[PDB]
Design a protein around this ligand. Structure first.
Ligand SMILES: Nc1ncnc2c1ncn2[C@@H]1O[C@H](COP(=O)(O)OP(=O)(O)OP(=O)(O)O)[C@@H](O)[C@H]1O
Ligand SMILES: [Mg+2]
Ligand SMILES: [Mg+2]
Lengths: 985, 147, 75
C-alpha cells in the first residue's frame, strides 16, 4: 500500500520491502533543538509509522539559531508543543505526537530511540534499558564545530544488505570441470572472494540450475572458480549467473561498556589521533554541565577552559586512557561549547536520520559505534574572535555568534549570493542561509532562479513545499517560505523563472554578475553546471557545486585564482547501446525498453509532427524532398495518418492496434528468421544464434493473455488521443471487436530507374491540399513518465515485455520500466541534508576569504556504508608564456575592439606569438590556412563587425564583451597554449 | 574542443588525406562534410560518398557522430546512413584523428562484416548470392555515388 | 607436447606445441585450423587469460593441459 506517487524516488533507493517494514516502526526523539528537529523532519519525510517528541524545556531566543520551526513569538513555550504542529504538515501518513513525561517502561513502545541534548547519566539510564530489550538506541550531540554520534542496535543485529549495491549478474561463456567459470569477451564479473552465486539457463550442466549458492574464488578480472563440479558434469556452456547476498550478524555493545573501550569510525584519515581526544572531551563536557547546573562553558572563557581541561585530565586518568591530551584542541572544544550552527545540525541530522532508517529497515551497514566529526578548519582567521566579540547579544544568532563572533556576523549579513535551482539541495541551501542570516544587512541580497513547477513526487524531499502548492513555481514558493522562516529576509530575496543558459544572458548579464559574491549550484544536469562554471570563471566568482545520487554525495568548491574549475574534471559518460543490438539482437531488458521507447516516439510523436508541419508550412513538401534523408517515409506517414488510416471511431483504433501488434511482434520476427534461420552458421562455422544473440520466436495473438491485452489497450488509447476520440477501458468492447479480425496474408520476401520519383509525385498529388484542411490539427504525444493516466509507461511496459517474450528475456514490471525509461535519478532527503550541511560549512570558509589551498576541502560520502572522506582541491595548472607565469584557467587578455589586423599585430609584437587560429563561440573567425582573398576581405574589419558578418546575426544591445579562443605558434613553430581573449566592445 | 578540432583541421590541411577530404561546413567548426572515395578493389569503385560529422561538445571524449548522406548498398549501413562501426562505439578512447575514422570507414566499405549486420536482408544476399550482391552494389554506387 | 583447446560449443581441438612456444604462435595455429583471427581469440587456462608477448612456460603450462577459447565478438 505504498504511495508510489509520493515515494517514487525514495523507493529506487530503499525498495518495497524496506519501506513496508519501515512503515511499521515507531521512533522516539528526545530533544527538539536544531538537531532534534532536523532528525524529526528527515524521519517524517522518510515515512516511518509515527514520531513522538519529548522536550519540556521552555523556548529561548538563542534556540532560534538552528530551529526553523520556532518563531520569536514562541518564547516561553515548550519546544515540542510548538514544533509538533509544524512537523505534522510535512507528511500526511506520519502522525506526530508529544509526551509530557517519560517513563522507562514507556520506551518499550518504540522501535528506535534517538537522544539529543541530554546529560550522560540520563543517557546511561536509558541505554541500560534499551539495550537488554532489543531497542535501537542512537545518541547525537553537536557542540560548535564538533559532533558525535553513537549507535547501539543490540547484540544480535541482522543486516541483510551491507553495501547497498545491486546484486552482480553476468552472462557466462564456459564452465570447466574444475568449476572455473568464465565471463563473455571483455566482461568483468566484479565478484569478490567469498561471495555466493546462483546459476540459471546453463546448458550441459543442469545441476547448477537448481539454485544452491556456491562459493566464489576470484582468479582474475574475467574468470573465477566455484569449486569441484566433477559429479555434475564435465563442461557447461552459456548461462547467466547472479550474485546471492547473505545476511550478516553484527553485535553492538552498550553505552556503559563502550565508554571504557570504544570502537571509533574515522571520517578522515589525515587526523586519526583526534577521536581519542574527543571521546574524553565530550564526557568532560557532560561532567562539567552536571557540576554547574547544566550550564556549559561560556564562549571563549579562559577560566571555564582551564576547569574543563582539568576535568578532561581527571577523566583520562580515571579511564586509564594512555593518550596524551592535546591542550589546544580540548580548549577549542571548551570555547565553542555553546555554539549552535545550522550547518553542523543539518549534517548530523542527515547522518542520524540515515542511522534511524538503517535500524528500522535492517539494511545498509550502520556506524559501529562512535563517530566523532569536526570542521575546525572553518573557524575564521581574518577577524577577531575573543570573549568580548563572542558574547551573546540577545538575538536569534547567538548560537552562531558564540562560534564566529559579531564581526563575522556582519560579514555574513552583507553577502550577495546567487543560487541556481530550487530543488531539494536548493531548498536546504535557502533554509541554511535564512538561519545563518545571510543577506539580512543593508547591502545584502539573494537571487534564486528555477523554471520548473512543483510536482507531487517532489514533496518527498523538498520540505519547503506543501500539497496545496502543487503546480506552482518553485522559486516563488521557496522565497515565500524562507521569508516566513526569517522575517528579516522580507524584500531581500528575488525569484526568477528563467532557465540559466545562453538564452538568458540578457537578464544574468555583466551588470547582474558583477555585484554577486558567490554562486551556488543546485542543478541536476551537466550542461547547466558547465555553463555556470564558465560564467563564474569569466567573472571570477567563487562557485559551490554539490551533487547526490541515492545515498552517495559529493561537494566541490571553486575559488578564483586558486583552484581548478568544475569543467576541468571528467566523469564516466552514459552508456548507449549499439544500434545493431537494439534493432535486431537484444539480450537484456534495457535493450527492449529502449526499443519500446523508440517505437512509441516513432508511432505517436514523429508522424504527427510531420502531418502538422505539412498542414502549416506552405513549402514543406519541396523542402523535405531534398532535405530529409527519407522523403518517401515522410510522404507515407502523412498519407497514412491523413487519408488511408484515419480512424472514424474507437473500433478502428482497436483494429489499428491489432494490426500494429502483428506488424511489430509477428511479421518482423518472421522476416528476421527468414534472413537468418536458426540453423544458419557464421563465416567461421560457428552457430549464428550463439552467445549475445538469442533466437526469437513469433508471437501469436492470444486475447486472454494479459500482456497482449495491455498492449492493445494502450496502443488504441494512445491512437485515440492522437485523433481526439473517446477511449474506453471495458474489456467487452475489445473482445467483441478483435473477434472479427482476419489477418492479412504475409509471406517473407526474398527481394530479387527514375520511375521512383514518378511514384513519389503520384503519391504527393494524391494528398489533400493544405487549403482544404484549415483548423485541423493532430495532437502529438509528449512523453510524460510521472502521469499514470496517459498510458505512456503502460504502452512502453507492454511493448518491452512482448519483445522480451520474443527473445526469451525475463520481463520486468512497470516499476523497473519506469525507472529505466524515465532516466529517474534515485534521491533521498538525508543525502540532501548532508550535502547542504557540507556546502554551508564551505561557505563560511569562502566568506572569510581564506587564501591557502590546504584550508578548503572537497567532500565525498556514501551513507550506505558510513563512509566520509575529505580532500584538498586541485590547484589550477600553471604555464610559461613569453617567460612569464600564467594561470591556465583564471587568466585572460583584455583588449579593445580593435581590427583583426591590429589584434594580430599586437599578438606578434607584444607576446612574440604568431596567431594561427581565432574563433568565437562555434565559428572560425580567422585561420592561417584560409585563402588570401578571404583574409584580405576580413582583415581590416573590426572584431564586432567580423563576428556579426560571419555569424549572420547582429549583436544584442546588452552584449558588452566577446570571448575569443586563440591558438598561436611560437617563433620556432612550436604550438603554445594561451589564455582566452576578452574583447571589450 | 575548439582547439583540438582545429589542430585536426590543420593536420588534414597539411598532410593530404588523398582518398578523403574533410572540411567545416560554412564556418562552423562543429559540423563537417567529409568525402570518401570508393576503393578500387570493391564494388563501390569510382564513387564519391558524402558524410556528415557532428563533433560533440565533450570531444575529444564523446565520439564524433558520423552519418552517410549518399545512399549505399552495404550490409552495415542502413537507409538513414548510420554506420555499424566499433571505433565510434567503444574503441574511440581519445587518441586518434579524423583520418583514422575515415580510414576505418574506407576499409569497412572495402569489405563488409555480415556476421553482425545492421541490414539483415543485404547481409543475407551477401552470404547466399554473392554475385547478385555485387551487381546490386555496383548499380547503387553508379546510380547515387556518381554524378 | 600435446594440448587440448575446448571451444564454446564443446568441441575439442588437439594441438602439438612446445612449452617455449609463444602465445602468438598458438593463436596463429588456431587461426590456421579454425580461421579465427588472433585478435578475436581469448584463450584462458586455470582462470588466467593468456596475453600476447608471453610463452606457455610463463603460465606453467605442462603436459596435456586444457585451454578454453572464447571469441571476442566485434560490433
Ligand atoms: N538549466 C537550469 N537552470 C535553472 N534551473 C535548472 C536548470 N536545470 C535544472 N534546474 C532546476 O534544478 C532543480 C533540479 O532538482 P531536482 O532534480 O531534485 O528536481 P526535479 O528534476 O524537478 O525532480 P526529479 O529529478 O525528482 O524528477 C529543479 O528545480 C530544476 O528546475
Ligand atoms: Mg521537476
Ligand atoms: Mg531532476
Amino acid at each position: 500500500t505504498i504511495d508510489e506517487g509520493l515515494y517514487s524516488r525514495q523507493l529506487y533507493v530503499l525498495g518495497h520491502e524496506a519501506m513496508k517494514q519501515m512503515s511499521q516502526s515507531n521512533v522516539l526523539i528526545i530533544g527538539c533543538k536544531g538537531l532534534g528537529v532536523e532528525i524529526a523532519k528527515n524521519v517524517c519525510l522518510a515515512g516511518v509509522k509515527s514520531v513522538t517528541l519529548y522536550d519540556p524545556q521552555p523556548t529561548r531566543i538563542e534556540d532560534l539559531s538552528s530551529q526553523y520551526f520556532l518563531t520569536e513569538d514562541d518564547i516561553g513555550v515548550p519546544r515540542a508543543k510548538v514544533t509538533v504542529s509544524k512537523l505534522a504538515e510535512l507528511n500526511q501518513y506520519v502522525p506526530v505526537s508529544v509526551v509530557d513525561e517519560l517513563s522507562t517502561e514507556y520506551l518499550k513502545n518504540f522501535k528506535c530511540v534517538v537522544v539529543t541534548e541530554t546529560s550522560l547519566t540520563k543517557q546511561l539510564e536509558i541505554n541500560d534499558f534499551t539495550h537488554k530489550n532489543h531497542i535501537a538506541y542512537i545518541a547525537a550531540d553537536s557542540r560548535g564545530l564538533f559532533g558525535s554520534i553513537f549507535c547501539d542496535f543490540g547484540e544480535n543485529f541482522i543486516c541483510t544488505d551491507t553495501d547497498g549495491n545491486e546484486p552482480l549478474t553476468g552472462m557466462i561463456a564456459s564452465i570447466t570441470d574444475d568449476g572455473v567459470v568464465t565471463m563473455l569477451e571483455e566482461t568483468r564479473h566484479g565478484l569478490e572472494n567469498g561471495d555466493f552465486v546462483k546459476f540459471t539457463e546453463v546448458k550441459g550442466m543442469p545441476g547448477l540450475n537448481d539454485g544452491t549458492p556456491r562459493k566464489v574464488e576470484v582468479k582474475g578480472p574475467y574468470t573465477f572458480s566455484i569449486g569441484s563440479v566433477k559429479d555434475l558434469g564435465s563442461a557447461g556452456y552459456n548461462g547467466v549467473f547472479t550474485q546471492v547476498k547473505v545476511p550478516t550478524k553484527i553485535s553492538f555493545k552498550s553505552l556503559r561498556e563502550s565508554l571504557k573501550d570504544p570502537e571509533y569510525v574515522y571520517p578522515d584519515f589525515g587526523k586519526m589521533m583526534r577521536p581519542p581526544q574527543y571521546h574524553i572531551a565530550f564526557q568532560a563536557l557532560s561532567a562539567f554541565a552536571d557540576a554547574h547546573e547544566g550550564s556549559l562553558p561560556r564562549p571563549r572563557n579562559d577560566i571555564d577552559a582551564a576547569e574543563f581541561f582539568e576535568f578532561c585530565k581527571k577523566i583520562a586518568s580515571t579511564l586509564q586512557f594512555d593518550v596524551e591530551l592535546d591542550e589546544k584542541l580540548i580548549k577549542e572544544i571548551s570555547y565553542q561549547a555553546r555554539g549552535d550552527l545550522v550547518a553542523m545540525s543539518a549534517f548530523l541530522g542527515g547522518a542520524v536520520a540515515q542511522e534511524v532508517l538503517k535500524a528500522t529497515t535492517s539494511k545498509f551497514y550502520p556506524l559501529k559505534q562512535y563517530f566523532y566529526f569536526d570542521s575546525l578548519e572553518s573557524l575564521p582567521s581574518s577577524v577577531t574572535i575573543s570573549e568580548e566579540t563572542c558574547k551573546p547579544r540577545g538575538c536569534r544568532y547567538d548560537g552562531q555568534i558564540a562560534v564566529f563572533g559579531s564581526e563575522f556576523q556582519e560579514k555574513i549579513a552583507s553577502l550577495s549570493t546567487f543560487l541556481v535551482g530550487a530543488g531539494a539541495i536548493g531548498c536546504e541551501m535557502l533554509k541554511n542561509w535564512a538561519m545563518m542570516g545571510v543577506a539580512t544587512g543593508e547591502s545584502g541580497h539573494i537571487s534564486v532562479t528555477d523554471m520548473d513547477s512543483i510536482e507531487k513526487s517532489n514533496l518527498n524531499r523538498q520540505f519547503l513545499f506543501r500539497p496545496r502548492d502543487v503546480g506552482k513555481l518553485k522559486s516563488e514558493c521557496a522565497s515565500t517560505a524562507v521569508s516566513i522562516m526569517n522575517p528579516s529576509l522580507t524584500g531581500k530575496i528575488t525569484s526568477y523563472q528563467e532557465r540559466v543558459g545562453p538564452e538568458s544572458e540578457g537578464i544574468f548579464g555583466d551588470e547582474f554578475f558583477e555585484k554577486l559574491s558567490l554562486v551556488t549550484n543546485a542543478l541536476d544536469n551537466v550542461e547547466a553546471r558547465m555553463y555556470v562554471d564558465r560564467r563564474c570563471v569569466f567573472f571570477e566568482k567563487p562557485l559551490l557545486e554539490s551533487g547526490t545520487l541515492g545515498t552517495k554525495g559529493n561537494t566541490q568548491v571553486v575559488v578564483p585564482h586558486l583552484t581548478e574549475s568544475y569543467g576541468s574534471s571528467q566523469d564516466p559518460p552514459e552508456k548507449s547501446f549499439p544500434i545493431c543490438t537494439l534493432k535486431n539482437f537484444p539480450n537484456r531488458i534495457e535493450h527492449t525498453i529502449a526499443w519500446a521507447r523508440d517505437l512509441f516516439e516513432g508511432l505517436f510523436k514523429q508522424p504527427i509532427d510531420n502531418v502538422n508541419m505539412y498542414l502549416s508550412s506552405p513549402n514543406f513538401l519541396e523542402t523535405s524532398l531534398k532535405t530529409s534523408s527519407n522523403p518517401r517515409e515522410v510522404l507515407e506517414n502523412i498519407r497514412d495518418y491523413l487519408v488511408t488510416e484515419k480512424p472514424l471511431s474507437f473500433e478502428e483504433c482497436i483494429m489499428w492496434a491489432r494490426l500494429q501488434f502483428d506488424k511489430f511482434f509477428n511479421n518482423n520476427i518472421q522476416q528476421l528468421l527468414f534472413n537468418f534461420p536458426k540453423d544458419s552458421v557464421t563465416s567461421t562455422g560457428q552457430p549464428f544464434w550463439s552467445g549475445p544473440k538469442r533466437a526469437p520466436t513469433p508471437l501469436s495473438f492470444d486475447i486472454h493473455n494479459r500482456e497482449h491485452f495491455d498492449f492493445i489497450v494502450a496502443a488504441a488509447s494512445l491512437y485515440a488521443f492522437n485523433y481526439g476520440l473517446k477511449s474506453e477501458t471495458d474489456p467487452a468492447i475489445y473482445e467483441r471487436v478483435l473477434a472479427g479480425y482476419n489477418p492479412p496474408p504475409f509471406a517473407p520476401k526474398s527481394g530479387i530507374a527514375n520511375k521512383d520519383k514518378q511514384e513519389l509525385k503520384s503519391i504527393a498529388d494524391s494528398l489533400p491540399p493544405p487549403s482544404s484542411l484549415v483548423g485541423f490539427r493532430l495532437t502529438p504525444a509528449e512523453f510524460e513518465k510521472d502521469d499514470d493516466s496517459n498510458h505512456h509507461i503502460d504502452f512502453i511496459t507492454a511493448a518491452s515485455n512482448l519483445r522480451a517474450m520474443n527473445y526469451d528475456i525475463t520481463p520486468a514490471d512497470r516499476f523497473k520500466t519506469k525507472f529505466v525509461a524515465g532516466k529517474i535519478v534515485p534521491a533521498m532527503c538525508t543525502s540532501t541534508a548532508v550535502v547542504s550541511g557540507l556546502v554551508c560549512l564551505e561557505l563560511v570558509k569562502l566568506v572569510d576569504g581564506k587564501k591557502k589551498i590546504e584550508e578548503y576541502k572537497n567532500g565525498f560520502f556514501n551513507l550506505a556504508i558510513g563512509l566520509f572522506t575529505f580532500s584538498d582541491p586541485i590547484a589550477s595548472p600553471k604555464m610559461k608564456v613569453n617567460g612569464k607565469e600564467i594561470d591556465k584557467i583564471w587568466d585572460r587578455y583584455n583588449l579593445p575592439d580593435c581590427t583583426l589586423q591590429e589584434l594580430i599585430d599586437y599578438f606578434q609584437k607584444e607576446e612574440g606569438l604568431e596567431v594561427t587560429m581565432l574563433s568565437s563561440g562555434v565559428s572560425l573567425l580567422y585561420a592561417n590556412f584560409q585563402p588570401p582573398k578571404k583574409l584580405a576581405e576580413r582583415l581590416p574589419l573590426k572584431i564586432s563587425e567580423l563576428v556579426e558578418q560571419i555569424t549572420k546575426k547582429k549583436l544584442e544591445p546588452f552584449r558588452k564583451h566577446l570571448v575569443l579562443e586563440i591558438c598561436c605558434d611560437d617563433a620556432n613553430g612550436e604550438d603554445v597554449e594561451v589564455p582566452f581573449i576578452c574583447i571589450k566592445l | 574542443a575548439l582547439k583540438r578540432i582545429n589542430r585536426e583541421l590543420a593536420d588534414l590541411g597539411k598532410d593530404p588525406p588523398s582518398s578523403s577530404s574533410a572540411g567545416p561546413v560554412g564556418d562552423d567548426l562543429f559540423h563537417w562534410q567529409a568525402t570518401i572515395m570508393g576503393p578500387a578493389d570493391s564494388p563501390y569503385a569510382g564513387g564519391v560518398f558524402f558524410l556528415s560529422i557532428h563533433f560533440p561538445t565533450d570531444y575529444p571524449f564523446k565520439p564524433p557522430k558520423v552519418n552517410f548522406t549518399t545512399r549505399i548498398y552495404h550490409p552495415n549501413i542502413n537507409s538513414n546512413g548510420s554506420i555499424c562501426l566499433d571505433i565510434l562505439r567503444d574503441q574511440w578512447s581519445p587518441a586518434l584523428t579524423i583520418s583514422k575514422v575515415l580510414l576505418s570507414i574506407s576499409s569497412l566499405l572495402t569489405d563488409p562484416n555480415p556476421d553482425d549486420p545492421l541490414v539483415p536482408e543485404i547481409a543475407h544476399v551477401y552470404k547466399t548470392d554473392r554475385s547478385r550482391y555485387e551487381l546490386s552494389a555496383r548499380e547503387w554506387t553508379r546510380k547515387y555515388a556518381i554524378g | 607436447m600435446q594440448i587440448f583447446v575446448k571451444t564454446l560449443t564443446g568441441k575439442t581441438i588437439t594441438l602439438e606445441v612446445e612449452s617455449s612456444d609463444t602465445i602468438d604462435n598458438v593463436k596463429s595455429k588456431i587461426q590456421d585450423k579454425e580461421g579465427i583471427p588472433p585478435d578475436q581469440q581469448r584463450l584462458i587456462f586455470a582462470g588466467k587469460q593468456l596475453e600476447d608477448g608471453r610463452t606457455l612456460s610463463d603460465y606453467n603450462i605442462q603436459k596435456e593441459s586444457t585451454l578454453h577459447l572464447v571469441l571476442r565478438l566485434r560490433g
